[PDB]
Symmetry: C2
Subunit: 125 residues, 2 copies
Amino acid sequence: LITEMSDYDIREMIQHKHVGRLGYVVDDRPIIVPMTFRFSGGSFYSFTTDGQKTNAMRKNDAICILFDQIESQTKWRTVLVQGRYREIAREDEEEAIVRIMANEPTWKPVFFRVDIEKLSGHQAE
Amino acid sequence: LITEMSDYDIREMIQHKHVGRLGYVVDDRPIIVPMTFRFSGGSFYSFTTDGQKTNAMRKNDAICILFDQIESQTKWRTVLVQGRYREIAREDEEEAIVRIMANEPTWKPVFFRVDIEKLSGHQAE
């Protein structure tokens, strides 16, 4: 019943789905929080004004993002990005901002990107 | 802009929101997967036929569930359950099944529950 999604559908999803759910680890326990992301040049870009998220991901840089479109229990698509927290230096914030905003599909903070180590996508129909 | 949700709204949400997103840890990295849950007698009950989830949560029982209702970037509610994977013994599966199904609000597998260590809920309006 569970199938691998085509690269086409994985791409449509990570290009067009604005909100994903970020997973990080604090003291060996998982935390999940919704965040907006922009896929650009092979990484996902975001930012937060929440210093607790920033400090947690600084201490443990192993993170993930789930994107999904759930129609029912048996009709759904999920894309999981596993990778690494990479904080953007102050002098690179303008670059990050333009990447986040530039030509977005008709949709102090600390900026970061998620560099991809594994990208997987599956569906049920 | 971010407020604590009332216990009333936290309860309405974990009673009526069928799908949450389960967080677990594999080799010090976070994984997130959508699952259906039932809140009953202070724990969340679910099951999976996916042996990789089962084995992962057996090896590391620190897990979480996010429930959320996101209207926009500035209008949303999130409830995070942090707790422990507790696998249901075969002889307790019928109990688990009746708990999952009994009087549900008009909505071999290995059964499990999530026992709650922290429950928090926040909103933005």
